[PDB]
Design a protein around this nucleic acid. Structure first.
Ligand code: CL
Ligand code: CL
Ligand code: MG
Ligand code: MG
Ligand code: MG
Ligand code: MG
Ligand code: MG
Ligand code: MG
Ligand code: MG
Ligand code: MG
Ligand code: MG
Ligand code: NA
Ligand code: NA
Ligand code: NA
Ligand code: NA
Ligand code: NA
Ligand code: NA
Lengths: 160, 186, 140, 95, 154
RNA sequence: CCUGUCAAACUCCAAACUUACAGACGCCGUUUGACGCGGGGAUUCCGGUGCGCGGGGUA
RNA sequence: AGUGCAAGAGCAAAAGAUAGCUUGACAGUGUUCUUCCCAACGAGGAACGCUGACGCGAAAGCGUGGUCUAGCGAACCAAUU
RNA sequence: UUAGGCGGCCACAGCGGUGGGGUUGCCUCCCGUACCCAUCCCGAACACGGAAGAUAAGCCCACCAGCGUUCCGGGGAGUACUGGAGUGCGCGAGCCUCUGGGAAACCCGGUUCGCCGCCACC
């Protein structure tokens, strides 16, 4: 279904699993990628993807944009390139759908999403000065798969 | 101790000196408390009342200031106890105090104990206190008959210091008599 | 400084953990004073469901009653190292436990102003081995 | 509300912050008030007896005699006058 | 001492705000009152802050308005120096004005209506949709600011 | 140890704010009698909109 | 932890545990709050008294059932004291 | 207060730790079971009687901040949030200005190793 049905953060926070049952498993394969044995401090360049609008991103998008981004890195810096990217948000907000018309309309559980405040960093990659343009391209591909407009912000990296 | 959520007992409960649950049932009477306390060598009796910043003591008596009237024997036994009660009781009377409830603190309500002795004494001084006669020791044991007859099983003095050999519960009578007497500087 | 620091036997408890008695007979005869029934909490599949119900007996010995018991009890056991408590207590064996402590334990056992014994004033395995070993037998 | 009992919606007002947990000091449980005295009403989570209807937590009444050991405090619920039977443990002098 | 002037009508304004304007003796648009600077009064003017124009007037300005819009507790009697003198603890308007500004007395204590019923602002005001810091006419003003307004509502 | 996130039915914290009582100012009442009390007569118990805060619902 | 059962809350020289004793789960009659915020409305409920009689305790005191909020039913008629 | 008793507030008082202190004085530990009394077995405790010994426990006194707690400074922060107003912006979600209020986390540095009341007492 369209994200138009869940991208807004207008409903109450709905995460208490001791009261919600039948929550669909997350499609997000993994949050920490690249060389997870190495430290983020071991890198000169640190670029993050910043969400420009407070929104809700369904686990299906996180995975799609994460996937399309890491898949790019892997393709440019090899399956074991010197880098490590992180998806810092987790889809805690449970989603419903009323699928009687409006009678007893409290919807059944259909999924999960992560609430991201504008200005926050969704993804954060770490690389050597000679890969910045690749991680920047990965991020560009990733923000085409989420609702908000985003900033590809370079933090540690005065090597321009 | 452990964290922000940790609960520290009221100081006098950590100290294990005050039983606040009994303190409450006690305060309910609205009457002054006749605090009866013991020591290894001494016996104390205070008449306490509730105050804005803590309890106020209106009259007391310590087994030690018993000698100040002639007591020449030990000061941590039955005769000593009874007398300390009577003394504190008399001062209480002088202070305008007329009634009180017996507070024995963390002591045990054992029949014939010294606290009930401190109680019988205060009562005789003319203080009205809720009591039960058969929980008190028999007159003789209050005098010190139990200790005298104990020295009978002598062979060796019961008292190191030189206060007679067979002891004198008469000294008790003579002391009590002294207090009952109108004179005596309280 | 030492006198009020040198170990002493506070109590020697001798109990028989049976599970369903006639045992009380021998304990009284071996110790010198009456036994004590021993009930149990919780229920077990080992046909031991009855919460309150005799299962064992014990005897808490103090003073001579405890020594005169050890003067023969100890001689029947090969005391070891690991067999000692962190506080200087040791249980060997029919169970025979020995509780050792310093001259002021009453501070932690009395009703009024009771307090727990400072660690420095607590007993140690070594100090325990010493005291005992120093009384007709060997350590480890 | 889903139910309409007395303790409905009192999860907060009838519970102690962790540290104030446990039996309360006897002093205020035996305090004495005089008629005309303004007193604040506030249930002590640790004291079961002598309470009043939770709706009245926060009221500042006027002591007007007593019944047994409890006090009879006059208040005004909205525009209606009511008399509340409450013990000292749940009362504090105004000012 | 501040000069209060209602610039926005009662329709749709909160009742507690309206009742404050009335407790400050103003019941119509363009009416003005002189209020002391106390903790209590400050609270009231802050609450009315959005439908009123206020500030401290200049001695002169006050004098002009008093002469032109002051009224007895009853009647059409013009408040001129003579009137002021024959009825107040002062000798003239400036004497009264000075007293008001120094918060020594009030229009009532001198048998004067607590309200100065001003005239619409000649040339118009700066709008009742924005505050002064935004080119509007609502809220607190400079003495130079209030003066212009008051003098225009002469 | 280090490292990544959350809560309508979590809370070591914690507002703005609402609220009891009192005093002060203001306003009001003592020929326009307030506050309150007793009595006669109703109508009314399909509401709607804006804004703020909401709960449900893709809307 | 336990405290009969939802959930939330209370409780540690206890409101929990063990032991012992006991029948206040008593009769009568009220005050007050609740039911029904404000704001009228019954049954029911609770809190807090008093009179009478008791239980326990050294005593203050506690006991108007269960630590607290659910466990309830008019008139007419019948049986019962 | 050269060591006590009863408390109030109930961690600023907790947890942990160092140093000091007692011949007929105080509190203790301590000594001891004929008695009042006591252990479902133990004078361990409780109760009673008492001074050979001790300052090692407790307790009292002086002190340490590592943990927990209280408060304060500076920073975070007039940020987050928010009562009132707007023909201010934005497709919208939402934001902004004016006015009145104003956190929390964390960090750095200070504070806190109890305060006070009545009684008795070289
Ligand atoms: Cl004592
Ligand atoms: Cl009530
Ligand atoms: Mg709530
Ligand atoms: Mg006129
Ligand atoms: Mg024109
Ligand atoms: Mg215009
Ligand atoms: Mg509200
Ligand atoms: Mg009950
Ligand atoms: Mg019928
Ligand atoms: Mg029948
Ligand atoms: Mg020392
Ligand atoms: Na249907
Ligand atoms: Na996008
Ligand atoms: Na048995
Ligand atoms: Na409490
Ligand atoms: Na009823
Ligand atoms: Na010492």
């Amino acid at each position: 279904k369209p994200a138009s049905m869940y991208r807004d953060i207008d409903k109450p926070a709905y995460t208490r699993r001791e009261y919600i049952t039948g929550i669909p498993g997350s499609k997000i394969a993994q949050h920490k990628m690249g060389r997870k044995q190495k430290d983020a401090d071991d890198y000169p360049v640190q670029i993050s993807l910043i969400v420009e609008e407070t929104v809700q991103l369904r686990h299906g998008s996180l995975e799609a944009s994460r996937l399309s981004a890491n898949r790019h890195l892997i393709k440019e810096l090899g399956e074991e390139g010197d880098y490590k990217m992180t998806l810092r948000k987790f889809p805690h907000q449970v989603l419903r759908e009323n699928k009687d018309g409006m009678r007893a309309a409290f919807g059944k559980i259909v999924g999960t999403a992560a609430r991201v405040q504008a200005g926050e960093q969704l993804f954060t990659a770490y690389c050597n000065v000679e890969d910045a343009e690749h991680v920047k391209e990965a991020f560009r591909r990733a923000y085409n798969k989420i609702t908000p407009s985003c900033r590809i912000d370079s933090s540690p990296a005065g090597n321009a | 101790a452990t964290g922000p959520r940790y609960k520290v007992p009221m100081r006098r409960r950590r100290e294990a000196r005050t039983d606040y649950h009994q303190r409450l049932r006690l305060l309910k009477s609205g009457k002054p408390r006749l605090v009866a306390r013991k020591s290894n060598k001494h016996v104390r009796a205070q008449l306490v009342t509730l105050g804005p910043n803590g309890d106020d003591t209106l009259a007391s008596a310590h087994s030690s200031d018993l000698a100040e009237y002639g007591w020449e024997a030990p000061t941590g036994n039955m005769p000593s106890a009874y007398l300390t009660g009577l003394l504190a009781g008399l001062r209480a009377q002088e202070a305008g105090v007329e009634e009180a409830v017996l507070d024995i603190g963390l002591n045990s309500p054992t029949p014939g104990s010294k606290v009930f002795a401190i109680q019988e004494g205060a009562i005789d001084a003319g203080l009205d206190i809720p009591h039960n006669d058969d929980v008190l020791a028999d007159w003789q044991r209050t005098r010190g008959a139990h200790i005298a007859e104990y020295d009978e099983q002598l062979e060796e003095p019961l008292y190191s210091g030189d206060f007679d050999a067979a002891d004198l519960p008469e000294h008790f009578d003579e002391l009590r008599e002294t207090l009952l007497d109108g004179d005596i500087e309280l | 400084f030492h006198e009020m620091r040198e170990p002493r036997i506070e109590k020697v408890v001798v109990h028989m953990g049976i599970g369903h008695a006639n045992a009380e007979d021998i304990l009284g005869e071996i110790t010198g004073q009456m036994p004590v029934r021993t009930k149990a909490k919780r229920t077990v599949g080992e046909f031991d469901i009855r919460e309150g119900d005799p299962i064992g007996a014990k005897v808490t010995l103090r003073d001579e009653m405890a020594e005169e018991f050890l003067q023969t009890a100890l001689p029947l056991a090969e005391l070891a190292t690991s067999q000692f408590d962190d506080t200087g207590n040791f249980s060997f064996g029919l169970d025979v436990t020995v509780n050792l402590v310093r001259p002021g334990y009453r501070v932690a056992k009395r009703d009024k102003a009771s307090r727990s014994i400072p660690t420095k004033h607590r007993l140690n395995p070594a100090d325990a081995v010493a005291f005992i070993e120093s009384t007709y037998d060997v350590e480890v | 509300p889903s139910s309409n009992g007395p303790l409905e919606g009192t999860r907060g007002k009838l519970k102690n912050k962790p540290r104030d947990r446990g039996t309360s000091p006897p002093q205020r449980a035996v305090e004495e008030f005089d008629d005309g005295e303004k007193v604040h009403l506030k249930i002590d989570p640790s004291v079961p007896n002598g309470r009043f209807h939770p709706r009245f937590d926060g009221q500042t009444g006027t002591v007007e005699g007593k019944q047994g050991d409890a006090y009879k405090v006059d208040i005004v619920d909205g525009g209606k006058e009511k008399t509340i039977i409450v013990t000292a443990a749940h009362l504090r002098r105004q000012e | 001492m501040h000069a209060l002037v209602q610039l926005r009508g009662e329709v749709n304004m909160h009742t507690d705000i309206q009742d404050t304007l009335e407790m400050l003796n103003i019941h119509h648009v363009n009416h003005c009152t002189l209020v002391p600077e106390t903790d209590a009064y400050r609270g009231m003017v802050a609450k009315v802050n959005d439908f009123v124009a206020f500030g401290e007037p200049s001695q002169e300005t006050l004098e002009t308005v008093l002469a032109t819009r002051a009224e007895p507790l009853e009647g059409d009697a013009d408040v001129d120096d003579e009137w002021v003198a024959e009825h107040t603890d002062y000798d003239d308007i400036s004497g009264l004005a000075f007293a008001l500004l120094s918060e020594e007395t009030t229009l009532r204590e001198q048998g004067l209506s607590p309200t100065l019923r001003l005239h619409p602002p000649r040339g118009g005001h700066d709008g009742v949709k924005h505050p002064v810091k935004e080119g509007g006419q609502l809220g607190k003003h400079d003495t130079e600011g209030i003066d212009d307004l008051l003098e225009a509502m002469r």
